[PDB]
Design a protein around this ligand. Structure first.
Ligand SMILES: N=c1c2ncn3c2ncn1[C@@H]1O[C@H](COP(=O)(O)OP(=O)(O)OC[C@H]2O[C@@H]3[C@H](O)[C@H]2O)[C@@H](O)[C@H]1O
Length: 252
């Protein structure tokens, strides 16, 4: 109890009951998924990582789950995001202008959770789970988010939007899942433009962050894939959200 196996937090308490109840809820609300069998979804999710070493997980381990969670989303309304979850979710909640990964069945099931098992027993590990940095990259949580993020980016078309945190020292981070998976899995045959919205964390009057070194790097990577790049500053995110709710406001 004074020294755990792995360096990451253990599985979320009641993980199996939580995933099953989220599936039931999502399928009650979204009519395109109203026929999914949630017991079958749980069995497939559990099959990906139970009795498997938690540093030896592959994208193939998640394929039965991917197949059951098959879902179409409007290809021209996708919002990617990195390190700014709260604003992305508050925005799409107003009137469903765009869709993030947590708007899909699989993203909704896993958001805010942690899970892992152990080799050659069928027990869930509630005490610790591998850290991506210290222990291993090929862990149950990291491999899941890479697999679903690649499929979501592959689905996009027309104009795709990305929200970025302009308070971080790498506004665009090549090492983030957006930078290592999303940028490279947009399909140039389908996607016309990537538009970044750089969210300010600061005061009021501040710099044009669309000139930031890392934003110029993103522009060069995307342009060399034969996709156009656009960038917009959101100086005051509080005012932005208000204008989405109430656009007749004079101040907009
Ligand atoms: N919803 C979550 C989530 N909820 C909790 N976590 C999530 N990871 C990814 N996702 C989604 O995957 C995307 C890719 O994640 P990444 O940017 O690598 O998370 P990072 O900012 O690198 O952080 C990933 C970490 O945050 C925990 C995971 O346990 C853990 O692995 C996120 O933008 C988000 O859409």
């Amino acid at each position: 109890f004074w020294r755990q196996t792995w360096s990451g937090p253990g599985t979320t308490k009641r993980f199996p009951e939580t995933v099953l109840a989220r599936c039931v809820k999502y399928t009650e609300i979204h009519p395109e998924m109203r026929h999914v069998d949630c017991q079958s979804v749980w069995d497939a999710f559990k099959g990906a990582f139970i009795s498997k070493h938690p540093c030896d997980i592959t994208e193939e381990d998640y394929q039965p789950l991917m197949k059951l969670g098959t879902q179409t989303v409007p290809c021209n309304k996708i919002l990617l995001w990195s390190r700014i979850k709260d604003l992305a979710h508050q925005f799409t909640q107003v009137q469903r202008d765009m869709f993030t990964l947590e708007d899909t069945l699989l993203g909704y099931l896993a958001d805010d959770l942690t899970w892992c098992g152990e080799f050659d027993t069928s027990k869930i590990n509630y005490q610790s789970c591998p850290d991506w940095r210290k222990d291993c990259s090929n862990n149950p949580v990291s491999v899941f988010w890479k697999t679903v993020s690649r499929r979501f980016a592959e689905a996009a078309c027309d104009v795709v939007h990305v929200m970025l945190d302009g308070s971080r020292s790498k506004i665009f981070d090549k090492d983030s899942t957006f930078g290592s998976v999303g940028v490279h899995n947009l399909q140039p045959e389908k996607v016309q433009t990537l538009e970044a919205w750089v969210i300010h964390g600061g005061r009021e009057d501040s710099r044009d962050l669309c000139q930031d070194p890392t934003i110029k790097e993103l522009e060069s990577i995307i342009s060399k894939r034969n996709i156009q790049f656009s960038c917009k500053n959101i100086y005051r995110p509080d005012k932005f959200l208000q204008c989405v709710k109430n656009p007749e406001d004079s101040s907009c």
